[PDB]
RNA sequence: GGGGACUCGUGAGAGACUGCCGGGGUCAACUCGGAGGAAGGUGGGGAUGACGUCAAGUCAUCAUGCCCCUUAUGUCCAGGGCUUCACACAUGCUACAAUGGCCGGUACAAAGGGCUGCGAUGCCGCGAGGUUAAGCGAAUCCUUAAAAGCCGGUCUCAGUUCGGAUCGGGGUCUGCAACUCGACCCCGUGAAGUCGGAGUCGCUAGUAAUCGCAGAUCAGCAACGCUGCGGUGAAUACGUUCC
């Protein structure tokens, strides 16, 4: 996003109910995972990368 | 058979029919069986004077009945007009007062359709 | 904070501007920000500004309406009507 | 070295144990009627058994685990249906016209993104 | 007895057997005794994304985690292969636990 | 569809009756999944049946499928400017599907409490030829019949 | 657009993921710096041609290959510039770095390197009607090609509309799993935006 | 304790390939029917989106050619707003009941989640919840009782023993904070709604339908949204005249 913004989610903010999560990669505030740190799309083309271990598609 | 100003309809089984009183329920009516002794399959063309004198009582001594909630509920609602408070004010204005949806919704709150 | 085991929430910023004053039997209007404290029966005829998001209104807590919310009060949204 | 049959219909679980006997089918130990309510189950408990006329004897014995009360059904049909032959090698091709050893498989597909459902949409709304 | 427990564990097949069943076996040599490999059920893990950056719902993306769990449980307990446990070269995939 | 006609489900025999019908009335009935619902329901209007019936229940509920079993529908057709209908021949394993649908459609809308009974004098009395299906078999016949001058468009 | 990755397809049919670790807990920590050590080795770096980037990860000791078209500038005066980066990468991580610089054995039959060759080319300004099919040429000496497809997409020359042109020859079965087929993209950069070239070269079934 | 019988777990595999027989066809492609077979002609589902089209969407994931601000479009913070409301459209959940309402008893799962945690038992409270605390980084323990289902009893066609919006009062939990604007619980209150016009949607089998369960995001959550798991479980398709 900001690069402002990103400066902010990667400082310790007042108020801890207040901290959030933005991407590893790209700082995209919506769509962020926690096990992975990292939003969608910067999920879905590292992941398609392969640069990320345990990952691939499905089918069932 | 007038329990209390309700006016029981006849040929009704009493768990249910103690609840048209404004104010008692079927949970309520659960323990107004209970503290009398009164047995929950009864048909209330059968009940006895002396069982009506038990619950002639009872709900007066520990319960509260119509016209005593009716004043109470329209007297806080007054309290809360007249103090201005925004759920007042909502109230006068007839839109959903606990922060409802009034952009595709508080029909409830309003009246019919009125396709301006 | 809702909850009748850990009392009730009321801002130290304000507990301390109106004790002082309750003390020494003053009626001055303390410019306040806080839609969040819950009115305890210490600023009975009382008279807050509260802000509504734009500007101040003051309020009068008389004898009853302090078993209310602050912020309660403040109307904020702009509406009159579409006609 | 006494046999001992496994049974399937979607999930269910059931492990057939023939004895020959005098007919008590003793299910997880429990009973029939009691266990399965259904007319329509016990129907087909005892169909492979009266297809091949040895209702009589051979009390079976069978542990219950998994689905609902149709998947146990046609697993134990299944259990017995591939338990007769093991005793018998001469019911194979009754049994294979009566089809009931065949497993039925039959199972509830997945569910696929943009849908309501398997299969069920969201509604069309053209315009 | 039960005194010596390993929780081999990876991401993926054809790691695992090999880091347990030529790597483990070095012990055996020594006069020990294994049970052989236990298989684990191996968990799922499951995930879904939009595949646009805008405006489509209709299209997404699935990916997946398997974290496959072996057990071995070498039973005979030798004071002189404890240390030839520890010098052991794992794969990198591979980690180990002691119980 | 496009490639010819689809495979039919096989309905295996009722264990209570020795008859098939049974077995495919209930699922007529079916509604939501409640088999077994259903089976007792049908079950239920047979057995209350047979005390006013004395004939054996399924022998009774024959009589009243041949009565209400279709023979001739009034199936739609548009040609020029004003569509019409058609006269055609009603193959035995639709006209009895049909018949049990009418059955379980009129009774679910006949005057009594519940459906037990419902459908149990429904039974009785489309043996007996005077019920609501028994009547919209003769009407529905009669209004193919006033149309069979369009027969000869047959597809 | 409306292809996928056929490294996404085949990541564990036929490729291999580029980092191999195993983690519960601190997994996200690690591709928090994972993510960073990758920015760190492409910038500044171009001039060396990344191939690709293998992280290993064990136990506090971690281990990072790189295959690159020239070990030649990374490592420089016998340990000037690699140790650089090894420094740059220990004040990144806290943590002891086997850091391995190894090759690629070939830098002009590897896609991801085919593709910044023709990107620096374009921003070299030359004509990229030539670019692609001197790529297809220098893509058809090696023993084992049997196809590669190159793909450029921009306003390529100035154009005010841009346009997007393949070339390609042999068999490249995108379609087919059991088809080893390596993809590279790149964003070559020029004084009128940013052109993609994407290549995607076959070599065989599998062995 | 014990055993490799079985299940199950998960590794390697085998099997389905018109493979064999009967008929038709230039002896072809193939086609109808059979034997064996768990599966028969692609066994089912998914992943898979050719060249291109829409100057389709995204300059707000990211990157970016040009254009634009620098005591302001930069930047920090408190509040309020993105949640408003005579209307209109779109997608959904609950209903308008007896194939049901309620009381009680009683069975049968699958897939996932758990250390900033799962909270077994015991006790308190009607309940949300509260406390002590065992065990568990998990095929171990928790989640967990799955719900629809079966049995018996009551209710008896009513705006009801339907519906649960609505309101008052009282609360729990999270969060510094619950009014704008969170979720959950108890009592009383008990609206519209009695099957919805023109018109219109989905669905061919373990499908529609219906019932719960789980997850991501997430301190909490408007979770009826989205992606998944399983219980019960259908009726029809003569056929291509028409759309
Ligand atoms: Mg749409
Ligand atoms: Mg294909
Ligand atoms: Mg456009
Ligand atoms: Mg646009
Ligand atoms: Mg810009
Ligand atoms: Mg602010
Ligand atoms: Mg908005
Ligand atoms: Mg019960
Ligand atoms: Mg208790
Ligand atoms: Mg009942
Ligand atoms: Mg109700
Ligand atoms: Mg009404
Ligand atoms: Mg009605
Ligand atoms: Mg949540
Ligand atoms: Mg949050
Ligand atoms: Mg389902
Ligand atoms: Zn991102």
Same mark, same amino acid.
């Given at each position: ?60 | ?116 | ?83 | ?10 999930? +269910? ?14 299910? $997880? ?8 309510? $259904? ?22 014995? +069978? ?11 046609? +697993? ?30 039959? +199972? ?20 | ?99 | ?12 025999? !009722? ?7 049974? %077995? ?19 079950? /239920?209007? #047979?057995?209350?049946?047979? !005390? ?7 022998? %009774?509920?024959?009589?009243? =499928? ?5 023979? #001739? ?22 006209? %009895? %599907?049909?018949? =049990? ?23 009785? !009395?489309?043996?007996? /030829? ?8 003769? !009407? ?16 | ?13 036929? &490729?291999?993921?580029?980092? *191999? ?37 064990? @136990? ?9 078209? *020239? ?5 420089? *005066? ?7 980066? @090894? ?41 990229? @009607? ?10 058809? *000496? ?48 020029? &004084?009128?935006? @940013? ?13």
């Amino acid at each position: 996003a900001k690069k402002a913004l990103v400066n902010k989610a990667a400082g310790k903010p007042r108020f801890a109910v207040r901290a959030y999560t933005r991407c590893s990669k790209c700082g995209r505030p919506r769509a962020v995972y926690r096990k992975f740190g990292l939003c969608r799309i910067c999920l879905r083309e590292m992941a398609h990368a392969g640069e990320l271990p345990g990952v691939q598609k499905s089918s069932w | 058979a007038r329990l209390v100003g309700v006016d029981l309809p006849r040929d009704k089984r009493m768990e249910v029919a103690l609840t048209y009183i404004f104010g008692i329920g079927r949970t309520r009516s659960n323990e107004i069986l209970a503290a009398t002794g009164i047995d929950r399959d009864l048909r209330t063309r059968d009940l006895t004077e002396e069982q009506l004198i038990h619950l002639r009582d009872y709900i007066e001594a520990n319960l509260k009945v119509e016209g005593d909630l009716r004043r109470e509920v329209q007297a806080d609602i007054r309290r809360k007009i007249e103090i201005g408070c925004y759920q007042g004010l909502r109230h006068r204005r007839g839109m959903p007062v606990r922060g409802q949806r009034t952009k595709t919704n508080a029909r409830t709150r309003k009246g019919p359709k009125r396709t301006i | 904070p809702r909850s009748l085991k850990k009392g009730p929430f009321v801002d130290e910023h304000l507990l301390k501007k109106v004790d002082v004053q309750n003390e020494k039997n003053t009626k001055q209007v303390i410019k306040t920000w806080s839609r969040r404290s819950t009115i305890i029966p210490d600023f009975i005829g009382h008279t807050f500004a509260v802000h509504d998001g734009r500007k101040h209104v003051p309020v009068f807590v008389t004898e009853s309406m302090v078993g209310h919310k602050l912020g309660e009060f403040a109307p904020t949204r702009t509406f009159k009507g579409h006609i | 070295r006494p046999i001992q049959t496994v049974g399937r219909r979607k999930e +269910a679980v059931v492990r057939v144990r023939l004895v020959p006997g005098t007919g008590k089918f003793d299910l $997880n130990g429990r009973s029939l009627e009691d266990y399965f309510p $259904n007319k329509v189950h016990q129907q087909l408990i005892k169909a492979p058994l009266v297809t091949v006329d040895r209702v009589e004897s051979f009390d079976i014995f +069978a542990h219950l685990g998994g689905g609902g009360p149709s998947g146990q059904a046609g +697993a134990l049909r299944l259990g017995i249906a591939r338990a007769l032959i093991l005793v018998s090698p001469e019911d194979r091709p009754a049994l294979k016209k009566a089809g009931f050893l065949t497993r039925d498989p039959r +199972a509830t597909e997945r569910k696929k993104y943009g849908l309501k459902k398997a299969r069920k949409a969201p509604q069309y709304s053209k315009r | 007895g039960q005194k010596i427990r390993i929780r081999l564990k990876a991401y993926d097949h054809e790691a695992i057997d090999a880091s347990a069943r030529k790597i483990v076996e070095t012990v055996v040599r020594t006069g020990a005794s294994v049970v052989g490999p236990v298989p684990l059920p191996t968990e799922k893990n499951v995930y879904c994304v939009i595949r646009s950056p805008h405006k489509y719902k209709d299209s997404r993306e699935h990916f997946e985690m398997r974290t496959h769990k072996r057990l071995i449980d070498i039973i005979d307990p030798t004071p002189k292969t404890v240390d030839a446990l520890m010098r052991i070269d794992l794969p990198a995939s591979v980690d180990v636990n002691i119980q | 569809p496009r490639k010819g006609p689809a495979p039919k489900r096989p309905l295996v025999n !009722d264990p209570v009756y020795g008859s098939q019908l049974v %077995t495919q009335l209930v699922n007529k009935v079916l509604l939501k999944g409640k088999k077994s619902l259903a089976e007792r329901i049908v079950y /239920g209007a #047979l057995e209350q049946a047979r !005390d006013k019936t004395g004939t054996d229940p399924v022998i %009774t509920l024959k009589r009243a =499928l041949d009565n209400v079993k279709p023979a #001739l529908e009034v199936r739609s057709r548009r040609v020029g400017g004003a569509t019409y209908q058609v006269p055609v021949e009603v193959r035995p394993d639709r006209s %009895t %599907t049909l018949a =049990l649908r009418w059955l379980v459609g009129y009774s679910r809308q006949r005057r009594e409490k519940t459906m037990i009974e419902r459908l149990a004098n429904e039974i009785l !009395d489309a043996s007996n /030829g005077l019920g609501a299906s028994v009547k919209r078999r003769e !009407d529905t016949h009669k209004m193919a019949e006033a149309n069979r001058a369009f027969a000869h468009y047959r597809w | 657009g409306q292809k996928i990755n056929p490294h996404g397809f085949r990541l564990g049919i036929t &490729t291999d993921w580029k980092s *191999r670790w195993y983690a519960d807990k601190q997994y996200a920590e690690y591709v928090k710096e994972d993510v960073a050590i990758r920015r760190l080795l492409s910038s500044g770096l171009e001039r060396a041609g990344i191939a690709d980037v293998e992280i290993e990860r064990t @136990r506090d000791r971690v281990r990072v290959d790189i295959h690159t078209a *020239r070990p030649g500038i990374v490592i420089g *005066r016998r340990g000037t510039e690699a140790d650089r980066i @090894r420094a740059d990468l220990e004040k990144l991580t806290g943590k002891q770095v086997q850091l391995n610089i190894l090759e690629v054995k070939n830098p002009e039959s590897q896609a991801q390197l085919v593709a910044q060759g023709v990107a620096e080319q374009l921003s070299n300004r030359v004509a990229f @009607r030539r670019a692609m099919r001197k790529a297809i040429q220098s893509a058809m *000496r090696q023993p084992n090609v049997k196809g590669i497809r190159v793909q450029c997409s921009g306003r390529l020359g100035g154009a005010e509309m841009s346009r997007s042109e393949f070339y390609r020859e042999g068999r490249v079965p995108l379609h087919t799993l059991r088809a080893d087929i390596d993809y590279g993209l790149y964003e070559a950069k020029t &004084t009128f935006g @940013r052109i993609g070239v994407k290549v995607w070269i076959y070599k065989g079934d599998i062995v």
